[PDB]
Design a protein around this ligand. Structure first.
Ligand SMILES: COc1cc2c(Nc3cnc(NC(=O)c4ccccc4)nc3)ncnc2cc1OC[C@@H](O)CN1CCCCC1
Length: 251
């Protein structure tokens, strides 16, 4: 049983459509964490946000070093509160804008962290279909943390099966992994274009190319992951064992 009076509120970390996220601290022990405040009146209008409740139930039973922890939640008369693990280094997206693009060691280490996390999720019957840089946070040691932002995803990261209105499964996560590996190395997504229509067309036809600096091992992995036919994509164990991943990962 938590209470608002148990925390000291600090600076705003980000803004959303149903409330904000603040840096906070437990008064007594002085423990740093993140607090998200949502307004009921807002939830019960944008839809029947019982979705929040299901998502909170699901997220609170996941324990992995590469998945952001939901420590708990409570509510009062007008607000609902989520107590979250704090990520000191911020978003991967912000880090990407600063460096322009990552080198092979950093990229390979990140892909390894995500495959492990996605593997644990699949065994828990949890499939994302979403995992943008903006939604990837960094811990104290620089480790990746997967957060739950789309609990309520532009075209760039969507797989062919989806925009083509077919049925999907856990194979969408392999596609996402390919788009991300590419964006990390090149600096931008593989199907980006001036119009929505052209992007839709390139994804469906799987039309993309690599800049000259991209390595052959990197091209190999990404070409295997971005397969039109979902069943032609490798298992997560095959990604963790790919020669390019093994050679450049710092472990
Ligand atoms: C972008 O800035 C942030 C968002 C965060 C954040 N956001 C977040 C919001 N919502 C959720 N979750 C949910 O909405 C949810 C819903 C249902 C069920 C479960 C979870 N998870 C994480 N969580 C934790 N830490 C965060 C840190 C953030 O920024 C950190 C920087 O400032 C620190 N700064 C320090 C100095 C150098 C530069 C970086």
């Amino acid at each position: 049983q938590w209470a608002l009076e148990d925390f000291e509120i600090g600076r705003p970390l980000g803004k959303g459509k149903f409330g904000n996220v603040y840096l906070a601290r437990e008064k007594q022990s002085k423990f740093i964490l993140a607090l998200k405040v949502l307004f009921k009146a807002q939830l019960e209008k944008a839809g029947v946000e019982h979705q929040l409740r299901r998502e909170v139930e699901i997220q609170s039973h996941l324990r992995h070093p590469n998945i952001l922890r939901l420590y708990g939640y409570f509510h009062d008369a007008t607000r609902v509160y989520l107590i979250l693990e704090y990520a000191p280094l911020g978003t991967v997206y912000r880090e990407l804008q600063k460096l322009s693009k990552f080198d092979e060691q950093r990229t390979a280490t990140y892909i390894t962290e995500l495959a492990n996390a996605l593997s644990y999720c699949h065994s828990k019957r949890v499939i994302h279909r979403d995992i943008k840089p903006e939604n990837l946070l960094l811990g104290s040691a620089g480790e990746l943390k997967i957060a739950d932002f789309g609990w309520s995803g532009t075209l760039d990261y969507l797989p062919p099966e989806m925009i083509e209105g077919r049925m999907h499964d856990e194979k969408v996560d392999l596609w996402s992994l390919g788009v991300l590996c590419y964006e990390f190395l090149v600096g931008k997504p593989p199907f980006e274009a001036n119009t929505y229509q052209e992007t839709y067309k390139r994804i469906s036809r799987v039309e993309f190319t690599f800049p000259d600096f991209v390595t052959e091992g990197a091209r190999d992995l990404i070409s295997r992951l971005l397969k039109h036919n979902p069943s032609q994509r490798p298992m997560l164990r095959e990604v963790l064992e790919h020669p390019w991943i093994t050679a450049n990962s710092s472990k």
